[PDB]
Design a protein around this nucleic acid. Structure first.
Ligand SMILES: Nc1ncnc2c1ncn2[C@H]1C[C@H](O)[C@@H](COP(=O)(O)OP(=O)(O)OP(=O)(O)O)O1
Ligand SMILES: [Ca+2]
Ligand SMILES: [Ca+2]
Ligand SMILES: [Ca+2]
Length: 376
DNA sequence: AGGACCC
DNA sequence: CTGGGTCCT
């Protein structure tokens, strides 16, 4: 029935990993760059008007003193990311990854184990770690309040372990489901944690200013709702279900309307090892098959260095962008799976390549990616 | 093969 | 000119 879920959210992740590489970079305003953008920056740099996905042009004019590090190669971020997940997995085996720097953990059985280990006189001694959302009053005879507080204590232990063992700093939110844990984790940042008591749930969801701030509502869904005059959380909460189902489908409608009330019963899913892995690169222009072939050889070479890992891929995919995306995939021959690997995959990929683009007609590629999936 | 979503 | 991921239809 009732759950205790934690959402762990690392502060300025890439920037943070960079500062643990050469500590010297600490105290100095830092940006991590990918091509022409600062994808994330530390809190020093952020204070001076800098923010994520803001171009170097709009980033150097506010901070001529902005320091830039190249973060196109995700290798070290990916490795640290899995170290965080593994350390969280020690607490409870059910950990779900969301991108490289967020994890949900279902702390329910863990909370329960801790409580039944306590005695009656110890119950009254239970205290919160970190913030309580909305400064809401704790009631120690409320069993839900007690469970959530034990949650906050486990969350603090997680954050202390991450810091002591990995040198990483992060936020956590403790709440009754994933949506709410994720909404609450960011209330105090960086490097703090907040617990959401059930009485403050409506306050948390109405504190949002647009429905696009609801996790699960992306670009397409938001713009759709905007085309129906739905702007605030309360609008979505009170809008006609039937009309909603019509315009977006039964699945999306009922789910996201449920989310507008802070209700989310989706389980925390054990992520385990990844289901795919890819190497990607983008560029102003690719217009020759020989250019493409070389980039593809680069991506594949790098990708093969990772294909060792934990399992082998049985499918390969190639994606391109032009001017959404386009792609072709096919199985990987079993003698190739049995592991010079480079020669036939390139041939495989180029055939895949010619399937979408024809050599003897003009074309302008802006992105190339190779993906290994269907792993066994 | 493409859609939607996440960081 | 970002670099990756997830599941669904
Ligand atoms: N279009 C995008 N929308 C959202 N996130 C993106 C997008 N493109 C890339 N990202 C990724 C790249 C970075 O890893 C990350 C950027 O910062 P983010 O994950 O939101 O938190 P952060 O760790 O960088 O800082 P913090 O969480 O403390 O605010 O999101
Ligand atoms: Ca986040
Ligand atoms: Ca973060
Ligand atoms: Ca959203």
């Amino acid at each position: 029935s009732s759950r205790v879920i934690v959402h762990v959210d690392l502060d300025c992740f890439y920037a943070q990993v960079e500062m643990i590489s050469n500590p010297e970079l600490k105290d100095k305003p830092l940006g991590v760059q990918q091509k022409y953008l600062v994808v994330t920056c530390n809190y020093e740099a952020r204070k001076l008007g800098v923010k994520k996905l803001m171009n170097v042009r709009d980033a150097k004019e506010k901070c001529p003193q902005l320091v830039l590090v190249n973060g196109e190669d995700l290798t070290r971020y990916r490795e640290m990311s899995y170290k965080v997940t593994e350390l969280l997995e020690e607490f409870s085996p059910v950990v779900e990854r969301l991108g490289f720097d967020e994890n949900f953990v279902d702390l329910t059985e863990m909370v329960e184990k801790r409580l039944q280990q306590l005695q009656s006189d110890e119950l009254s001694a239970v205290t919160v770690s970190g913030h309580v959302y909305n400064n809401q009053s704790i009631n120690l005879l409320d069993v839900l309040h007690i469970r959530l507080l034990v949650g906050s204590q486990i969350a603090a232990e997680m954050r202390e372990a991450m810091y002591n063992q990995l040198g990483l700093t992060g936020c956590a939110g403790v709440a009754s489901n994933k949506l709410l844990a994720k909404l609450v984790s960011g209330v105090f940042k960086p490097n703090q944690q907040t617990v959401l008591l059930p009485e403050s749930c409506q306050h948390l969801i109405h504190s949002l200013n647009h429905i696009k701030e609801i996790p699960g509502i992306g670009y397409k869904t938001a713009k759709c709702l905007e085309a129906l005059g739905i702007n605030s959380v309360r609008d979505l909460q009170t809008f006609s279900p039937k009309i909603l189902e019509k315009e977006l489908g039964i699945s999306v409608a009922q789910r996201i309307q449920k989310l507008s009330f802070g209700e989310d019963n989706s389980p925390v899913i054990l992520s385990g090892p990844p289901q795919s892995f890819s190497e990607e690169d983008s560029f102003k222009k690719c217009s020759s098959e020989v250019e493409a072939k070389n980039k593809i050889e680069e991506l594949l070479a790098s990708l093969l260095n990772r294909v060792c890992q934990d399992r082998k891929p049985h499918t390969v995919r190639l994606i391109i962008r032009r001017y959404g995306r386009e792609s072709r995939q096919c199985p990987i021959p079993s003698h190739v799976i049995q592991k010079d690997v480079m020669t036939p995959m390139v041939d495989i990929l180029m055939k895949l390549f010619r399937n979408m683009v024809n050599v003897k007609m003009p074309f302008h590629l802006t992105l190339l990616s190779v993906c290994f999936c269907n792993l066994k």
